[PDB]
Amino acid sequence: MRFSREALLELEASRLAPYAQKARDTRGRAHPEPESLYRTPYQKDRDRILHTTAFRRLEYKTQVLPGWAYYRTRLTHTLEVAQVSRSIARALGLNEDLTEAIALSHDLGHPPFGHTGEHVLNALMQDHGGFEHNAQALRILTHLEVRYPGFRGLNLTYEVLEGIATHEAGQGTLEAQVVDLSDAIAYAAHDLDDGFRAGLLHPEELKEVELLQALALEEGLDLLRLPELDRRVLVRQLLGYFITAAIEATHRRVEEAGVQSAEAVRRHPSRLAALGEEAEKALKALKAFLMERFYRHPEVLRERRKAEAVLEGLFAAYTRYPELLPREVQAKIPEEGLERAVCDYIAGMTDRFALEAYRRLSP
């Protein structure tokens, strides 16, 4: 058999929950292009996102601390957010292709040097419009990436752009909302894992957060030493915990709310995706813990200090001496302005290239 777009669109509807976004109800794309045969609107979006340059750089930008040296990578993170969100979405009868498309694209606008990047760039741009990673992702997918003759951007569906702009706020689709939740879940589980693997977190500290200790004690996990088998078991159980609670709590809110359409979610007075009172407490506890014991760890901070100096040295040099910029970037100044042109350029850099560019600027 051959399943056409039409057949898939029909199958999608009637299979998904009422409140889930059906691809056939899409508001469409900005620019007109022939509708494909075989691929669903979101399916196509997934395909384009995967081939963007920014998605590719994700493999050369790290999560948490700067690349240069075993710390996941923004790509590993994304794949994990994609796994958690799709998992939760399917359990809730939500649109999985929409969920996926959003998880794959939401972190495309991050500059090099995990999160530290966004804070320094936004600071350097205080009087010029600032800088925000969600807005940057959108800017890339609607303006900076040119892979199709006829228009700048990827010409993605309203729903995916909508997702990037509303997820991580009452608005957006349950799909989009599920992605932001998955992002938090993923961050927690994997930072914990990297924290330990990197010898930065110690087994004895697990007691500081009640969910972790509860899980270590329940599985007879060897503390003080927390061997890999035990680590892998703690991480998996933790992921299962939040995913399970996201499903049960979101299902609860969606039913109690009575929404029977994606439009209803979009318009509801609050967001439905939730963890439930106890899970939100655990995660919040886990978040504070990781920030204190991992992100603020001295070895992590000494790298963060370096990432800032690199971005600061790049920004100052290019903004003071635009003639140092590649001609292709100098060409964009009239249409974008000096600061934006410099900011887009630095933000599209990989950690490895930013450091190198920085180094080539000095004797």
Q: Where does this chain bind Mg ion (CB under 5 A)?
A: 107, 183
The answer to whether the beta carbons of residues 53 and 61 sit under 8 Å apart is no
**Residue 31 engages a copy of itself in binding (rule: CB under 8 A):** no
User: Within 153-172, which residues bind a copy of itself (CB under 8 A)?
Assistant: none
Angle, helices 277-290/174-197, rounded to nearest 10 degrees: 40
What are the CA-CA distances from residue 304 to residues 64, 67, 111, 114, 336 (Å)? Answer: 9, 11, 13, 9, 29
Shortest Å, Cβ 155 to a copy of itself: 13
Q: Measure the CA–CA gap between 317 and 166, rounded to whole angstroms.
A: 35
User: Within 56-75, which residues bind a copy of itself (CB under 8 A)?
Assistant: 56, 59, 72-73, 75
Give the pair of three-digit tokens for residue 147: 């892979």
User: Within 130-149, which residues bind a copy of itself (CB under 8 A)?
Assistant: 146-149
Shortest Å, Cβ 246 to Mg ion: 16
The answer to whether the beta carbons of residues 31 and 150 sit under 8 Å apart is yes
Cβ neighbours, 10 Å, residue 186 = 25
The one of Mg ion, a copy of itself, none whose footprint includes residue 183, by CB under 5 to 8 A per kind, is Mg ion
The answer on whether 77 is annotated among ligand-binding residues is yes
The one of Mg ion, a copy of itself, none whose footprint includes residue 92, by CB under 5 to 8 A per kind, is a copy of itself
What phi and psi, each to the nearest 5 degrees, are found at residue 24?
Answer: -70, -15
The count of residues in the chain is 363
Interaction site with a copy of itself (CB under 8 A): 1-3, 8, 11, 15, 17, 19, 37-39, 43, 46-47, 50-51, 56, 59, 72-73, 75-76, 79-80, 83, 87, 90-93, 146-149, 224-225, 229, 232-233, 235-236, 244, 247-248, 251, 254, 296, 298, 301-302, 305-307, 309-310, 313, 321, 323-327, 330, 355, 358-363
